[PDB]
């Protein structure tokens, strides 16, 4: 799980 | 696990 | 588990 | 800039 | 700048 | 599990 | 910047 | 800057 912002 | 902000 | 800002 | 692996 | 492994 | 700012 | 693992 | 392992 990647959460990238 | 990733969170990148 | 990463979090990074 | 988010990798998550 | 976030790298998670 | 790391936790950066 | 964070880098973990 | 926050390496952690």
Chains 1, 2, 3, 4, 5, 6, 7, 8 share one sequence.
Do not use: D, E, L, R
Request: proline share 0%; charged share 0%; net charge neutral.
């Amino acid at each position: 799980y990647t959460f990238g912002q």
